[PDB]
From a paper:
The androgen receptor (AR) is the cellular mediator of the actions of the hormone 5-α dihydrotestosterone (DHT). Androgen binding to AR leads to activation of genes involved in the development and maintenance of the male reproductive system and other tissues such as bone and muscle. AR is distinguished from other nuclear receptors in that after hormone binding, it preferentially responds to a specialized set of coactivators bearing aromatic-rich motifs, while responding poorly to coactivators bearing the leucine-rich “NR box” motifs favored by other nuclear receptors. Structures of AR in complex with FxxLF, LxxLL, FxxLW, WxxLF, WxxVW, FxxFF, and FxxYF motifs reveal a changing surface of the AR coactivator binding interface that permits accommodation of both AR-specific aromatic-rich motifs and canonical leucine-rich motifs.
In FxxLW and WxxVW, the −2 serine forms a bidentate hydrogen-bonding interaction, making hydrogen bonds to both Glu897 and the backbone amide group of the +2 residue. However, the presence of a hydrogen-bonding partner on the indole side chain enables an additional polar interaction not seen in the phenylalanine-rich motifs between the indole nitrogen and Gln738. Only the six-membered ring of the indole group is fully buried in the pocket. The five-membered ring of the indole side chain sticks out, solvent exposed.
Numbering used by the authors:
A (entry chain A): 670 to 918
B (entry chain B): 99 to 107
């Protein structure tokens, strides 16, 4: 029974630092350059994590890369939200041990409204008493929550994979529950929570896209993979060619 | 590309 959960717990990424100089004065360029670097570093971990997920290899190679490239933002925000909840009870955004955002940095980063939503998401982990197991399963499901409207190379293997991950999330809920009405209510809350991640990720997508375009003008550096994915994949999302899969309407 | 590089690794 614990087979699926054993795996998710086993492959969960450890701590990742951003390499931020917390002894230097906060500035838009410094903060954003550190966040971009952190994205580059976490992307490497997301790639190795995803590749180890049950059944991930069933997907066509090109789709494997695709889902990672479309979902990285939501995945990273979700996990960051969890770190914040567990490390500082959502009081600040715990991006990395060396990059913790307080209200001041939220303002200097010029993405205060987005940070607020992320902190709100972080608060939900508490307001809903999300278990470490529900967290893991929901995070896995977020990798299979955004695809092009024209479908993937092999849409069939993906649908099968997404369906099984929904089944696993349903299994976890029905675990310490014998009441079918309680399970339905918990599933409703979790799916609602999962959906709330997409609007936040889209705001970050728009923001990083605009920032990439004018990076040379604000002294903000974008690592190589980030620059590539944000100029090639993110636009497909912003233009509506690639869309999130919502549980509710 | 860097991504392709990392994917190969
Ligand atoms: C994904 C990251 C970095 C990893 C993380 O913990 C979540 C956080 C959310 C905001 C992202 C940031 C990476 C760099 C971005 C994309 C900046 O360009 C603007 C928004 C930033
Ligand atoms: Na690419």
């Amino acid at each position: 029974q614990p087979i699926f959960l054993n795996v998710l717990e086993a492959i969960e990424p450890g701590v990742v630092c951003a390499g931020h100089d917390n002894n230097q004065p906060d500035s838009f360029a410094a903060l954003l350059s550190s966040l971009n670097e952190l994205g580059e570093r976490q992307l490497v971990h997301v790639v190795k994590w995803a590749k180890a997920l049950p059944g991930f290899r069933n997907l066509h190679v090109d789709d494997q890369m695709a889902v990672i490239q479309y979902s990285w933002m939501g995945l990273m925000v979700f996990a960051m939200g969890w770190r914040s909840f567990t490390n500082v009870n959502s009081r600040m955004l715990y991006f990395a041990p060396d990059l913790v955002f307080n209200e001041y940095r939220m303002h200097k980063s010029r993405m205060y409204s987005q940070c607020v939503r992320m902190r709100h998401l972080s608060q939900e982990f508490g307001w809903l008493q999300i278990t470490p197991q529900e967290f893991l399963c929901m995070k896995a499901l977020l990798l299979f929550s955004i695809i092009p409207v024209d479908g993937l190379k092999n849409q069939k293997f993906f649908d099968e994979l997404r369906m099984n991950y929904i089944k696993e999330l349903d299994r976890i809920i029905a675990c310490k529950r014998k009441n079918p009405t309680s399970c339905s209510r918990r599933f409703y809350q979790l799916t609602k929570l999962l959906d709330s991640v997409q609007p936040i990720a889209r705001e970050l997508h728009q923001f990083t896209f605009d920032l990439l375009i004018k990076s040379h003008m604000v002294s903000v550096d974008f690592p190589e993979m980030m620059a590539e994915i944000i100029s090639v994949q993110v636009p497909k999302i912003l233009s509506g060619k690639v869309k999130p899969i919502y549980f509710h309407t | 590309s860097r991504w392709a590089e990392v994917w190969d690794d």
